[PDB]
Design a protein around this ligand. Structure first.
Ligand SMILES: NC(=O)c1ccc[n+]([C@@H]2O[C@H](COP(=O)([O-])OP(=O)(O)OC[C@H]3O[C@@H](n4cnc5c(N)ncnc54)[C@H](OP(=O)(O)O)[C@@H]3O)[C@@H](O)[C@H]2O)c1
Ligand SMILES: NC(=O)c1ccc[n+]([C@@H]2O[C@H](COP(=O)([O-])OP(=O)(O)OC[C@H]3O[C@@H](n4cnc5c(N)ncnc54)[C@H](OP(=O)(O)O)[C@@H]3O)[C@@H](O)[C@H]2O)c1
Lengths: 435, 435
């Protein structure tokens, strides 16, 4: 079924050899590589629709926004900017080292490893791949085995665009991953849970391999007394229930000022009941196990269910759920939920709200603050370390090529997208020229 | 002697609490912190001169250039620019997320850890510290154990400038280091050997701690036919034998075209036997145990000694030595020498020279090329991965704040100096504001 370790070693060796050919050095090569990836993605749209529907119940419109469209936009943006990015940057020379001409080169790493997660398998495998490509690297991709249909199409896309010595997909489970992690890769890009990130970095240490880790945690959505409540409910609906809550930058929990909680939940519960009435309205959880995990949490919570909490394990379905009266103590606040459940906590003092986030779940991937006072909103953001942040918005910062997407501490290290992907998949090389 | 684990934990805990105060937020505080650092260094030069002469036999002018002057120049560069650096950067917003306003914030990591090497203990502890400071972090510094005198002065300099809740020195050995590496630091800066880099990274993995590793390797100095032999010998004399060859960016070995090898070696050997005649002309090796290691290598060499070889383990000294007729097989081409020995190898064409360096000792911290054909010299540099590179010069690239300094692969991960220190000691936080 999966490649044997021998064939994996052999595939790895052919990429090492291919890189040493310096085939990837010129920008003309890198640009046509992007054109071939783009073309291969477009050729396989319909297969991606079916694969993502089967694996995760993703609607076609979502796939076009968050999966296919996200990648194609990054590709087009990279193509229009690559000539600028690969150009040597000349710097001044101080007098102590004069006379000399100095400049900075962004130099490729070599053979790279991309580990793909289940939840947005196209976005989070192929967008970093763009990084590897424009940086002048080769790449081995291991998509998630828990989304088998889309992993197969990803392999088909890559096989169709590229020779395996340049870019290859290796499907596999635990055993194939630990084997690949033991190889002397030159760069490793991982997207997944904090505990597996620890495993990836530990393996990376043994070969001194630099890593980027895009991890998780619990993103708060904080609602100030002066927030536009319809706007807030809209973003909650979008952010919390897209892909059954299986999003790294999804609002994990709601942190609302006591004085607008009743009015907020009234709007929210009504819209959930109206727009998400079916048990599989949000999509599918990736595995039956995940549904059972979430059901146990619901069975253990001290909060009050306002809507939902209906589950069909065999369907991999859990209805959109809102749970009121939750404390930091609650089972729903122990771990990242990654499910269509929204626990609701209350605050009065903004200073205390800040402290509570920092104390219980610090450094999330994103902090969301909803309100009309920008000083108060920005002030909250500036006092909560997080990967990224938004005021009166959700998720869409990850779809901008101008913004460095990445976490801090337990939510990760390193950033990418746009120019930042290029800088992430190269190292800075100083050059000093003496006459 | 050394602080107990209980007080180390107690010291670490206080920096966490102090960072949480947001004391380090405003740029004014950071600028004053550098001023206090600068004055503390200046007010202690004499003690540094003595300590460094005692530990390593460093001449006053070497200390003025590569130690005291190096961090003073960085401090002044940082002070002159920091106001511009800390200002949030507004970025474009694509139409897909309109309407919104977006910007990037460079946000401090928190409590950082700086491990100092023996060979340049002032430069490679205080220059990273500058980054820690201007990043808005706190810092715990552990200087090398093997240079008692200077480490003691560093502690004095740091205590003079800073309260221990902000920046603190903790002297110690392997046991103190492994205990510090077990604490939940928010960032670790390491300078040292590759094998210890693995230890540091493996420990950082357990807390998802981002690292920068400034490591080792064997920097080649490659000599083309039309090179200036006078220039070449001057730079070798300067680069190879400064601090007894205990320099990370020193030319470890000489790699010279066959047609000029004899002429170059006549010029080089004559200069060595006259300018470096005594057993301790180059200075002191760090330990007696090091001397013994170097001598043993000379015993096993298949190459012909041309000068020096004489050594005195008792006074931590070894004579400037040039070894001719060396192949990659040789016991002198196995490890990083880090001593007063210059092995000399030879090649028949540029093509073979490039391929042999990449084959036997790839990714060194620096590649040096001497010749007057720039297209050829650059051509070599472009085909050998390395942290940094020079044509017709050595070492001085590390003394320009406009140049990022750092390795690749075995020579390390990450860069610093100048603006790059600010960027390394912070993370990029995207912020999107929706009306
Ligand atoms: N910052 C971001 O960009 C981002 C994006 C999406 C998700 N996330 C985070 O990812 C997590 C959820 O996604 P996930 O369930 O796919 O994370 P995951 O469990 O860490 O899996 C990620 C990848 O690593 C493999 N894997 C899982 N457990 C492993 C283990 N003990 N040892 C070795 N490999 C292992 C997986 O293989 P298989 O799946 O094939 O078994 C998968 O390919 C959440 O924490 C989320 O916040 C972050
Ligand atoms: N890229 C750069 O910035 C740069 C510049 C110059 C030199 N270097 C590198 O520095 C290296 C040599 O210096 P060094 O001997 O001081 O490096 P080192 O042996 O790796 O030690 C560096 C630090 O780690 C501690 N340490 C050493 N060995 C250890 C072990 N086995 N376990 C745990 N901790 C350990 C040391 O404490 P104690 O020393 O107090 O015992 C010291 O503070 C060379 O490889 C050179 O290439 C790098």
């Amino acid at each position: 079924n999966y490649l044997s370790p021998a064939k994996i070693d052999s595939l790895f060796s052919a990429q090492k050899a291919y890189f040493a050919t310096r085939a990837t050095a010129d920008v003309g090569f890198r640009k046509q590589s992007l054109e071939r990836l783009k073309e291969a993605v477009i050729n396989n749209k319909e297969a991606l629709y079916s694969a993502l529907a089967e694996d995760l119940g993703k609607p076609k419109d979502v796939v076009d926004l968050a999966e296919i469209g996200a990648v194609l936009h990054e590709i087009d943006f990279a193509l229009a900017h690559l000539d600028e990015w690969v150009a040597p940057v000349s710097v001044p020379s101080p007098d102590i080292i004069a006379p000399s001409e100095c400049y900075v080169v962004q130099e490729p790493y070599g053979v790279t490893y991309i580990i793909g997660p289940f939840n947005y398998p196209v976005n989070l495998t192929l967008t970093p791949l763009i990084g590897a490509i424009i940086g002048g690297n080769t790449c081995i991709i291991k998509p998630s085995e828990t989304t088998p249909e889309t992993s197969a199409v990803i392999e088909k896309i890559i096989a169709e665009a590229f020779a395996p010595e340049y870019v290859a997909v290796i499907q596999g489970g635990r055993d194939e991953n630990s084997h690949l992690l033991s190889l002397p890769f030159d760069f490793i890009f991982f997207t997944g849970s904090p505990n597996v990130g620890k495993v990836v970095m530990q393996a990376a240490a043994k070969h001194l391999t630099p890593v980027v880790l895009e991890l998780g945690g619990k993103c708060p959505l904080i609602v100030l007394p002066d927030a536009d409540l319809d706007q807030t409910v809209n973003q909650l609906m979008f952010g919390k229930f897209i892909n059954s809550g299986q999003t790294c930058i999804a609002p994990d929990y709601l942190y609302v000022h006591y004085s607008v909680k009743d009015a907020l939940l009234e709007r929210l519960v009504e819209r959930v009941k109206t727009e998400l009435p079916e048990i599989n309205s949000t999509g599918k959880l990736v595995t039956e196990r995940q549904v059972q995990r979430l059901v146990s949490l619901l069975e253990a919570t001290q909060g009050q269910v306002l809507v939902g909490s209906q589950a069909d394990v065999s369907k991999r379905a859990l209805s959109a759920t809102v749970v009121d009266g939750v404390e930091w103590n609650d089972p729903l606040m122990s771990e990242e939920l990654f499910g269509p459940i929204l626990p609701v906590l209350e605050f009065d003092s903004v200073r205390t709200a800040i402290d509570q986030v920092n104390k219980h779940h610090p450094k999330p991937l994103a902090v969301y603050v909803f309100g009309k006072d920008m000083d108060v909103a920005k002030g909250i953001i500036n006092q909560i370390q997080s990967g990224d942040a938004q005021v009166n918005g959700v998720m869409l910062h990850a779809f901008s090529p101008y913004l460095p997407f990445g976490g801090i501490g337990a939510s990760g290290m390193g950033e990418y997208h746009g120019h930042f992907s290029y800088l992430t998949f190269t190292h800075k090389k100083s050059v000093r020229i003496v006459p």
